[PDB]
């Protein structure tokens, strides 16, 4: 279980301290290693801009480019580190470049594939929804906007969440369905932390915006319905009044408004309740590493906790000397990372779609 | 949001939207078939915008 950093040319195996991070609430997974060498040796394989591939054991965790390298030495100590992110983090700080700033009738996957072409990032679309693939009647790009900003703006309206794969690709992820692992307070937990704060969760999220009137719809739409648009999503966990009004982000319809309102309600639900645990082993029970987007069964019933299933949201692996092998796994409810079409557990079309939604491994009719 | 560059990254998009709200443009194509004139304008640089509606007061009309 050695952490090998495939840099440009050769392998690097031994390390003094390793820290890797992965999450689905982010578009990259950053790593930081500590290297210790005699003063005067050549450290050029670890330089900013080199193409790195981190490999834990025989499996690749991150791939991309090296960002920073710190070297310090005092009268009684010496410390050298190195850092980096994915190749998907190349989009975060780079400005989106396209010829015609407007896409007339395109879907989110096609927009992303046209935007991530010059860099090298490959886009991956996992959702099998019929409404998440609905094409944009028109989508324009603000000038000097990063690819990350544009794709996040589109994915927020679609309800999809954008993430980075373990091989450097872009991913429009799908939440897990089958409970795979178990975390109990008695057997395999060193430390738990259960925070439950209600300072942000509201009752009724309602979104208001402007209708579509640019061109073809301008010969049909009237004057009042251009300005009068609305969407609502109600929560049953807050029993007081507690409303919220959201100004839309782009041109809006009723169904689009309802989708964003839920998107917001589910994100608030995910951000409210948080579980944190420190397990002893990097590897899982089966043997693979711990990664986000996994549905685990929590049995912290000796501490009077009544949650039964959660979804991992953040995994950070540590190799400090004082720590040993640890991985701090953070947990959030699954119902916070779903698309507005699906729900947590009127015709033949509805029945067939239900069947093919309950069974995702089957091929839809499309 | 402790570093100068981190604060710059956090605060840039708001100023970008502020600076991009109002703009100038040139007119290349005018379509009058619709109930509202649809221009095809050209923004700062290497940026086009098709089907941009023009608003004119009631009682006056003109085709540039």
């Amino acid at each position: 279980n050695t952490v090998t950093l495939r840099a440009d040319g050769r392998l690097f195996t031994g390390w003094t301290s390793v820290s890797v991070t992965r999450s689905i609430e982010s578009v990259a997974g950053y790593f930081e290693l500590g290297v210790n060498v005699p003063p005067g040796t050549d450290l050029s394989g670890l330089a900013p801009g080199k193409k790195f591939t981190l490999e834990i054991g025989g499996q690749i965790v991150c791939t991309g480019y090296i960002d920073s390298r710190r070297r310090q030495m005092t009268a009684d100590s010496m410390k050298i580190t190195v850092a980096g992110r994915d190749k998907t983090a190349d989009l975060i700080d780079c400005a989106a470049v396209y010829s015609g700033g407007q896409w007339k009738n395109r879907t989110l996957e096609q927009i992303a594939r046209d935007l991530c072409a010059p860099y090298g990032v490959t886009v991956r679309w996992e959702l099998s929804d019929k409404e998440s693939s609905a094409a944009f009647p028109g989508f324009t790009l603000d000038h000097s906007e990063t690819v990350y900003e544009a794709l996040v703006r589109a994915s927020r309206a679609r309800g999809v969440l954008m993430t980075s794969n373990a091989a450097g690709e872009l991913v429009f992820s799908r939440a897990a369905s089958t409970a795979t692992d178990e975390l109990v307070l008695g057997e395999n937990l060193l430390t738990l932390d259960f925070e439950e704060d209600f300072r942000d969760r509201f009752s009724e999220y309602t979104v208001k915006g402007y209708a579509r009137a640019n061109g073809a719809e301008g010969d049909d739409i009237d004057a009042k319905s251009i300005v009068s648009r609305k969407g609502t999503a109600t929560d049953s966990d807050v029993t007081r009044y507690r409303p919220m009004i959201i100004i839309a982000d782009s041109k809006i319809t009723a169904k689009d408004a309802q989708a964003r309102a839920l998107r917001e309600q589910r994100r608030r639900l995910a951000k409210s309740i948080t579980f944190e645990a420190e397990i002893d082993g990097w590897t899982r029970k089966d043997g693979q590493l711990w990664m986000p987007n996994l549905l685990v069964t929590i049995d912290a019933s000796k501490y009077a906790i009544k949650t039964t299933e959660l979804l991992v949201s953040k995994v950070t692996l540590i190799l400090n000397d004082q720590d040993g092998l640890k991985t701090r796994v953070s947990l959030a409810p699954r119902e916070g990372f779903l698309v507005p079409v699906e729900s947590d557990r009127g015709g033949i079309d509805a029945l067939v779609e239900d069947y093919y939604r309950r069974h995702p491994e089957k091929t839809p009719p499309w | 949001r402790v570093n100068d560059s981190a604060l710059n990254r956090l605060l840039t998009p708001l100023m970008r939207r502020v600076r991009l709200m109002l703009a100038r443009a040139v007119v290349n194509v005018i379509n009058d078939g619709r109930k509202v004139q649809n221009l095809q304008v050209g923004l700062l640089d290497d940026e086009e915008s098709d089907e941009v509606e023009r608003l004119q007061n009631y009682g006056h009309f003109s085709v540039p």
Binding site: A28, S155, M162 | R9, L10
Partner: peptide
């Protein structure tokens, strides 16, 4: 720097705007 690193990394949930 827990929040100072979440800015340099992506954030599919927008902080502002």
């Amino acid at each position: 720097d827990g929040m100072g690193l979440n800015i340099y990394a992506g954030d599919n949930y927008i902080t502002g705007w």
